[model samples]
Target chain A: SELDQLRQEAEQLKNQIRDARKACADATLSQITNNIDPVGRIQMRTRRTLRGHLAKIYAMHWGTDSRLLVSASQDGKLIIWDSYTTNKVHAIPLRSSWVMTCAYAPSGNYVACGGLDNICSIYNLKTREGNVRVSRELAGHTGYLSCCRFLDDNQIVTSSGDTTCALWDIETGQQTTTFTGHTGDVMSLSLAPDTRLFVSGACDASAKLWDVREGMCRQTFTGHESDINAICFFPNGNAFATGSDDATCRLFDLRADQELMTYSHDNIICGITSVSFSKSGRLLLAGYDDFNCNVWDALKADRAGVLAGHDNRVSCLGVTDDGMAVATGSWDSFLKIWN
Target chain B: CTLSAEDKAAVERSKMIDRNLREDGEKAAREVKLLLLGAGESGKNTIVKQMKIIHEAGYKTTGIVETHFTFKDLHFKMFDVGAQRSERKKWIHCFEGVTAIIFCVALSDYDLVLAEDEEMNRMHASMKLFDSICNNKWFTDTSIILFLNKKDLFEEKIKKSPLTICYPEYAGSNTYEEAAAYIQCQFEDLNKRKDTKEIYTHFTCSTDTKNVQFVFDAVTDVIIKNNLKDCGLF
Candidate 1:
C-alpha cells in the first residue's frame, strides 16, 4: 500500500501543474449565465468606476439585479454607479459626515445607509430616476455605524460602534430585536449564502456566528490579533472567510466548527474587503490591503497566488456569477476589472 | 378645691389604661383567616408581611389568600381563594368561614414557554382553591378582592443595555417604576382570567409600598367597594 501510494504521488508530481492559468481557464467567463442553472464559472462582471467622492470609498455592494454598484464614501455621500458605464448613476449627499455603509434590498426596491450620523435611513428605490421615497430615519446608536445589510425585503440589519446589532423592520420602521452580545464595535456582518446563519466580526478581535431563527449565538470564532475588517460567505453558503488587521485571512467551515485554513499576507488586511467563492467552487478570492487580490485553489492542498496590477491598496472587491472576472475599488480613486 | 387622695389615685389609673390602649391599639380584636399557596418566589411571604403591617396598624388583614377564607371584622367578613390544581382538595378549607376573599397573583413571572409549566402548576393549585370557594354554602356569600402583583415589568420592551445593575448576591433592586410595573401586569392578567362574580383585581406593591397610611387607604377602598362600612368598622 505504501509503495502504491508513493507511485501515485510520483506520477502526480511528474505531471506539469499549471495552477493559476488552469484556474483562470477552468471557470472561464462564458459560464456566468442563468441558463447553466446550478453549474458555471462565476466571476466579477463589468465595474463602472464610481468617482467624484472626495474621500475613501468605505463600502460597496451590488443591487439585487447585479446591474448597479452602490458606493458609500467617507465624504458623506451615497452614490449609485452605473455598472455598465462606471459613471455616477445617482448620488445623495447625506446631511451628516461620512456615510460609511450602504445596504441594498433583496427585492431591488429599497436602500438603507448608516454612518457617522449614527442614524439608519431607508430609501425606497422603486424608480430608475434615483428618486427615493424616504420611509424612516432611525437614530439611537451613539457612535459611528460601520455596516448595514438586508436580512430580507422588509427587515434590515445594522452594526455600529455602540457595540450592538439591531434588527429593524424596514417597512414599519420598528426595531424587532437588538443583539448586545458583542463587547466592541461590530465592523461587518455577512449572512451565509445558504442557511439563515450569519457572521458578525467586530473590534473586540472576535467573530461570532449567530442563528437568526432562535436569536442565539451559535459560536464565536476568535483568533484575530486585531479588529476584524470584513467577512463574506462562500458560494456553497456553508463556509466563510474573515479578514483582520492581524495581517491574515482565515477560512471558517461552519459545519466542522473549525478554521479550515489561514493565509498570511505581508501587511494588515484592513479597510473594506470580502472573501467569496468563485463560480466553480474551486477558488476563494480575497481582496486585501497590499494592492492585490489573491486567489486560492481549493482542489489542491494549497495553490496560492496574487493578481497584482493596482498601484494602491485594494479596499473592496465584487465577483460576478461565472468567477471569470472581478471589480476592485481602491484609495487611489480608481476602479479596475480583472479578467 | 383640693381633691382627695382617692380621687387623685383614680385619675392616675385611668391615664395608665389610656397609655396601654394607645401602645397596643384600642380597636376590637380582628379575626383574619388567610390562604397561602403559590409558586415559590412568587412573593407569597411578602404579601403576608404587608398584610401584617396593615393589620397591626389597626386595619384588618387576612393572610396571603391562596385559598378561600372567612374573615370577620365588626362590619364584615371576607373569603378568598386562587387558581392552583394540586390543592384542589383544600378548596373546601378556603370556604370554611369567609366574609371576603382577596386572591393575589404575581404577573412578572409569566413567560409563555420559559415559565408556562410552573405557572400552570400554580394555576392548577389555584383551581382547586377556587372549587372549594365555589362549592360551599357557608362560603357562598363572600366578596372577593384580587390583588395582582408584579405588572410593572411589561411596561417597557426588553432591550439590551450597556449598563448592568448588580445587587448583593440575590438582592434585587425594586425601584418605584419596576415595582409599579410588576404590580400592574399582575392585576391586569388576573382580572382577565378570573371567573367569579364580585371579583376585582387591584395593583399593589405589598412589600415595597408598606406604610400605615397606604394600608389604611387600601383597606378603606376595599371596605367601600364591598359596602362593608354598613356593618360598623367605619
Candidate 2:
C-alpha cells in the first residue's frame, strides 16, 4: 500500500512538470511567429516538438544554454523539461486557480509562476544537483495575475484582471508598487532590458508607458480600435510593438510620437504572447494566435518567414543567446523548437 | 353582343383616361435645381450630367432635388445636392440625415487652395451656412467631407501657376501617403470641433468619376463596423 501511494504521487508530480514546459514553449512560439511572418505569408520551422497539456500554455522560458525548458499552464501546474532528451525533469503542484503565466529568471537560478490563486511562486533551480524545488511564494495580486516576468534576478511585474500591474519584491515577498490607471483588465506587460521603461496594455483600448524607475505614468498611446492585448519593447528601446483584438499589430515609435506602421491579420491577435528583438536590433521575433511565429528583419521591414503547424494559437516564445534558434509553445498541447 | 352604342363609348373613354394617367406617372416634372459652387468652372455639369444644363439659365428649371443613395453596405449616404444662386439660402435646408457634407472645388482653380479673395468669400459663406445649419437642432449631427475635384489636373495646373497656386501644408508634399494621413487628421479635428462622428476627405477628378464605389465601400466599412444598419456586411 505504501509503495502504491508513493508511485501515484510521483506520477502526479511528473504531469505537473510536463504542463509547465508546454507554457514556456507556447510563449516562445508566439514571438517566433510574429518576427518571421509579418505579412501572413511564409512557412514555419517547428522540427523539434513536445506535446502533453490540456489547457492554455500561459508562459515559457529556456535556460541560459536552452538545455532546460520551463512552462506553466491553465491547469495550475508547472512543468520542466530537458532540452536534449526532452523528458520531464520535475513538476510543481498548484492549488486554487489556473496558472496564468510563469518564467525562468535570467540567472537560471529560479523559476517564477503567477497563478489564478493570486500567488506568484518561485522555484529554486539547483544546478549543482540539477533539480528543482519550491523555494518560496512571491505573493501580491488581489486576483489572478495572468502574466509575470522577472525585472532582474529579484523583482517581478505581474498583470491581473484586477486592472492593476503589481510589482513584486521577490526577496521580501512584498508588492513594490500597484500601477493603476488602466480602466480595463491588464492583459500583459513587458520591461525593457535596461528596465527603465515598463509597459502595460489593457482591454481599455490603451497602452500605457511608464517610467519604471520613478513608478510614474509617462505617456499613453491610443490608436488601437479594440483591446490592447500585448505590449513589448524593442531591444533598442526606441520603438515597441502592440497587438490588439482589432486584428492588427502596430509598431509605435516612442521617439516620434506616431504609429510607424500597423499590420493587419486574419486572427484577433489575442496577446503578443512573446516578442524578442535580435541582438543587433535588426531582427524581430513575434508569434500570434494564428498558430504561426514570424521572423522579421527590421532593417528590411520585411518578414523573413513563418513557422506554423501547432493547430492552435502560439502563446509564448523564447530565443537562444546566439539567435540561432527559438523555443515555442501553443494551445495544441505541444512545444516546438526552430532554427 | 348585349352592349349598346352608349356602353361601347363609355368603355373607350375609360381607356383613354387610363392611358393618360400612365403617361403622366412615367414623365415626372423636370424641376432641375442646380447650385453652383467653387471659384471657377469645375465641369459641375459633368458630375450631374444633364443637371448642369439647368444651371445655364437657358432652361426654366422649377426647383433642385438632391438625391441621397443608401446602399445595403454603406453606413453613410452619398449626397448629390445642388445649390442655385437664388436658392443659396435653401442649400442648408436639405442637410437632414447628411452625415457627410462635401465642398466640391476644381483642381484648375489652384488659387482656391491659397484662399483667393473670391475663394475665401465662397468659403466663408459656405462656413457660415454650415455653422447656421449645424446650430439648428436637426442638422447638428452632420459631418463634412471636402471633395477636391479635378485632382488629375492638379499637376498640370501646378506646372502653369507654380507660384500662384499655393498648396496646403498637407497637399504640398508629393507623397500620397502623407496627404492621406493629413486628410484623416484634419477630418478628425473637424469632427471633434463639430461634435460629430469622425469624417474623412479625399481628392478625385470628376471628369473621370463615373461610379460611387469607393465612397460606398469606405462608408460601408464604417457603417458595418459601427453596426448602424439593421444587418451588417462587415
Candidate 3:
C-alpha cells in the first residue's frame, strides 16, 4: 500500500496543475480574441455609400478578400463594385430581372443568382463577359430559386420553394442530391466557415443543420414563431443566428444543441429581413422591417448600436471577411458600408 | 426448336398482355423492387450483371436498367440507373419506393482524383454519393446493402497506391487486410442511419463467377433473385 503511494501521489501532483492545462488549451484563443474590444467601445461608423443599383437592392455579397461586391436589384441588373474606391467594376444585365438572391463565388471571377424565374444563373464577372454562354446554366429546380450559395467554383447548393435544398454540379448543371426534409419552402442558408455543414431556414418556422456530404439534416432547431427569413453563422462556427418574421433574432448553439438567447425589441414590432455576424463575432448585425440596421453585442446580448440612415427598410447585409467593415443594402436603392 | 421470328415477337407481345392479365394492376400483387445506385464506374451496373448469373439474370435505356426475373414463384425486379450527372436525374423517378438499395463503390478508387477537380478525391466523391442515397427521403425506411466491389483490383492497386493519399487519417501499415477493413469501416460509418437501418456489406469481384455467387449467398435475405422466360432482351 505504501509503494502504491509513489505512483498514486505522482498523479495527485499532476492533477494539481489540471487547471493550467485547461488554460493552455485556450491559450491561443485568449490571444486571438485579445484585440476584441468591448461591445460599446467598438466603433462602427458609416464608411462608404454604394448607390449604383437602379432599383431597390435585394442582395449584396462581398468577395472573399473584402474589396469587391456584387449586388442584385429589381431593375434586372447585377452590379459588381470595387468597394474600396466606389468604382463600378462590372455591371451584369439579367434576362429575367426577377433576382431574389446573389452570391459571389470563391473565385471572384464568377457570381451566382436565383430569382422567381426558377433558375439559378451564373455570370462571368470577368466580362458578363461578351454576353456569351461560357458554361451550362443551373435550371433544374421545379420551384422558384429561393436562395443559392456556391460550394465552390464547380458546385452550388440551392434552396427552393419545392420544400427541398439541392446540391448541384455547377458545371454539369445536374442536381446530385436533393435534401427533402423541410415541410415548407426552404428559404435561406448559410454555409459553415470550414465544413460541409450548412444551416437552412424554412417557412416551416424551423432551422435545420445539414451536411452536404450526405445531403441530410444533422439537426433541426426550432424557436421562431414565424417564417425564418434570415440565417448567418457565427464567426467561430459553434453557433448560428436567425431572424424571423416574428420580429426576433435568436442564437442557436451548435454544440449544446439548444437555443442560447434572443435579440428582439419591445418598442419596435417589425419582422427581420436579413442578418450577418461581424468577423470578430463581437457584433450581430440585423436588418429590420423597420428602417434600421440594428447592431448588438454577440456574446453580451446587449443592443450596441443602430444604423439609421436608410430611407427604407434594410433588406440585406454583409460583413467583410477581414472584419474591417459592414455592408447593408436597403430598399432605398443604396448600400452603406460601415467601419 | 427453330421458332419463327414473328412467332417469338407475338409470344413476347402476348407476354406483356398475359402478365397484365395475371396481375390486373400494380396494386394487385406488389413486386419486390430494388434500386442500384453508385457514382461513376463504381460498378452499379455490374451488380445487376451479377444478377444475370447469380440470379441468372436493355436497349431504350433512357440510361435506366430494369432487370426482371421470376424464380421460385417470386417476381423480382431491380432497377440499375446511371451514376453520372445526367444519369442521376433519372434516378429520382426510380426512387418512388424501393424494397432495398444496392449501393456500389470501387475500393481501388481510393487514391484517384475526380476529373473535374484534382483536389477532390475520387473516393471522396463516392462517399458523398453514398451519403446522398442513404439519406434519400423514400429510402430512409428502406434497407441498404453495400457492394465494395472490384476487390481484385483493389488488392493489387493498394500495393502501388497509398490509402493515405485520400485518407490521411488512416494510421496503419498499408497491407491488404488492414486496408480493406479500413475501407469497410469508411463506407459503414458514412451511413447516419445505423440505428434504424443496417448497411449490409460484402466485398465483391463482380466479374468473377464464384465470388458473385458467394456474395449473393451471404445475405440472400437482403436480396433474392428470380428468372422468368428469357426469349427477348430489352
What TM-score would each prediction reach against the true structure?
A: 0.48, 0.49, 0.53
The order by descending TM-score is 3, 2, 1
Taking the tens digit of each residue's C-alpha lDDT, what string does model 2 give over A79-110?
A: 77655544555655564224657777778778
Off by over 4 Å in 2: A1-44, A127-131, A265-274, A296-302, B1-234
What does the lDDT read for residue B61 in candidate 3?
A: 27
How well does candidate 3 match the true structure in TM-score terms?
Answer: 0.53
Model 2 Cα lDDT, one tens digit per residue, B1-234: 898987676556545543553353233111111232343334242554422332321221212233422334222213342323322222233333433445454544444533535455433344444444335544454444445566666555454443323334543544445544553454344333544343445455543422344544444443444455345432
Which segments of model 3 are wrong by more than 4 Å?
A: A1-38, A41-43, A127-134, B1-234
What's candidate 2's DockQ score?
0.00
CAPRI grade, predicted model 2? incorrect
Please give, for residues A1-339, the per-residue lDDT of candidate 3 as tens digits. 888999899789667645444444433333555577664655667788766464567788888879888888756567777666566655676765457799988878778887655678876755534552324477766665667888688788888766779888877778888798787677788898764788999887889988987888877778689887889998878899999888888888776666666788788688888998877776888988789877877766668877788997687888776877778888777888788
Ranked candidates (lDDT, high to low): 3, 2, 1
Mind giving the per-residue lDDT tens digits that candidate 1 earns over B3-104?
788756655654553354334323212333333334443524366555455453343121112221222323322223233222222124323333355555
Q: Write the per-residue lDDT of candidate 3 for residues B30-68, one digit (tens) a residue.
A: 556667677766555356665555545411222334667
Error of 2 at A303 (Å): 3.8
